[PDB]
From Swiss-Prot:
<comment type="function">
    <text>Inhibits protein synthesis. Does not cleave supercoiled pBR322 dsDNA.</text>
</comment>
<feature type="glycosylation site" description="N-linked (GlcNAc...) asparagine; in PD-L3">
    <location>
        <position position="10"/>
    </location>
</feature>
<comment type="similarity">
    <text>Belongs to the ribosome-inactivating protein family. Type 1 RIP subfamily.</text>
</comment>
<dbReference type="InterPro" id="IPR017989">
    <property type="entry name" value="Ribosome_inactivat_1/2"/>
</dbReference>
<feature type="disulfide bond">
    <location>
        <begin position="84"/>
        <end position="105"/>
    </location>
</feature>
<feature type="active site">
    <location>
        <position position="175"/>
    </location>
</feature>
<dbReference type="InterPro" id="IPR036041">
    <property type="entry name" value="Ribosome-inact_prot_sf"/>
</dbReference>
<dbReference type="GO" id="GO:0006952">
    <property type="term" value="P:defense response"/>
</dbReference>
<dbReference type="GO" id="GO:0090729">
    <property type="term" value="F:toxin activity"/>
</dbReference>
<keyword id="KW-0378">Hydrolase</keyword>
<dbReference type="GO" id="GO:0017148">
    <property type="term" value="P:negative regulation of translation"/>
</dbReference>
<keyword id="KW-0611">Plant defense</keyword>
<dbReference type="InterPro" id="IPR001574">
    <property type="entry name" value="Ribosome_inactivat_prot"/>
</dbReference>
<dbReference type="GO" id="GO:0030598">
    <property type="term" value="F:rRNA N-glycosylase activity"/>
</dbReference>
<keyword id="KW-0652">Protein synthesis inhibitor</keyword>
<dbReference type="InterPro" id="IPR017988">
    <property type="entry name" value="Ribosome_inactivat_prot_CS"/>
</dbReference>
<keyword id="KW-0800">Toxin</keyword>
């Protein structure tokens, strides 16, 4: 499995763009695409995982482990007192957990467990972070930088600190890779903190449905319209692929042929 590094501490818009390109190119199936939009592979294609190393301004790092087929974060590692400290979500199988141990921390004599004792659903992360919605958790480059430093190499930290980091990282890494719209929210706000708008949230919550609709669309027309939210919280009834393609970075895996095109 490959490691993609993003230097948060020294980030620029172009470095972030390159990071997004690199992550999409690593994770996508080598061939699958619909309407020109690359698709993630099935759950069998190897490597099954991608590592994303995030570096803060003090050169400390956290490495996220992502499932390639859906870009979900499985866990993360940090260097702690010389040890590879692995933090695994509580919602993956025993066989995947073995893979997370060995992929984050291949040397079995130099590693240490520090579990994430909760699941990776946004509702859970929000609860641990003390928010009723992740619209209340600002995103941003400086925030990500700061949050890395609250964890990496740190003996103890609260669940709220951890869940804030996870909310920010999951969105700025995996959601941004899935959605050019989210990448572009980060870029438009690159020098400052921002709150995820209704369209960010709607896209995040509907990636599966959107991916299916694009895969199934015939001559650019969705078989069944898909109702999302615009950034001003008005309904967005999507009728055609060209209305939503600009916001897409990656499609969720959907079996069978589509217009590639």
């Amino acid at each position: 499995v490959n490691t993609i590094t993003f230097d948060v501490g020294n980030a620029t818009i172009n470095k972030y763009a390159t990071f997004m390109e690199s992550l999409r190119n690593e994770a996508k199936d080598p061939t699958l695409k619909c309407y020109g939009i690359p698709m993630l592979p099935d759950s069998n294609l190897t490597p099954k995982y991608v590592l994303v190393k995030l570096q803060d301004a003090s050169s400390k790092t956290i490495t996220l482990m992502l499932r390639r087929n859906n870009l979900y974060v499985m866990g993360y590692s940090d260097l702690y007192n010389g040890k590879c400290r692995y933090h695994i979500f509580n919602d993956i199988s025993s066989t995947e957990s073995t893979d997370v141990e060995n992929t984050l921390c291949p040397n079995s004599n130099s590693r240490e467990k520090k579990a994430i004792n909760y699941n990776s659903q946004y509702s859970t992360l929000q609860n641990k972070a003390g928010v009723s919605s992740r619209s209340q958790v600002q995103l941003g480059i400086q925030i990500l930088n700061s949050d890395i430093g609250k964890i990496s190499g740190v003996s103890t930290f609260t669940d709220k600190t951890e869940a804030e980091f996870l909310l920010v990282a999951i969105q700025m890494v995996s959601e941004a890779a899935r959605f050019k719209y989210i990448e572009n929210q980060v870029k438009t706000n690159f020098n400052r903190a921002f709150n995820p708008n209704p369209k960010v949230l709607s896209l995040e919550e509907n990636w599966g449905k959107i991916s299916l609709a694009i895969h199934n669309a015939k001559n650019g027309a969705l078989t069944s319209p898909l109702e999302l939210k615009n950034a001003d919280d008005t309904k967005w009834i999507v009728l055609r692929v060209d209305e939503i393609k600009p916001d897409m970075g990656l499609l969720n895996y959907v079996s069978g042929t589509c217009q590639t095109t």
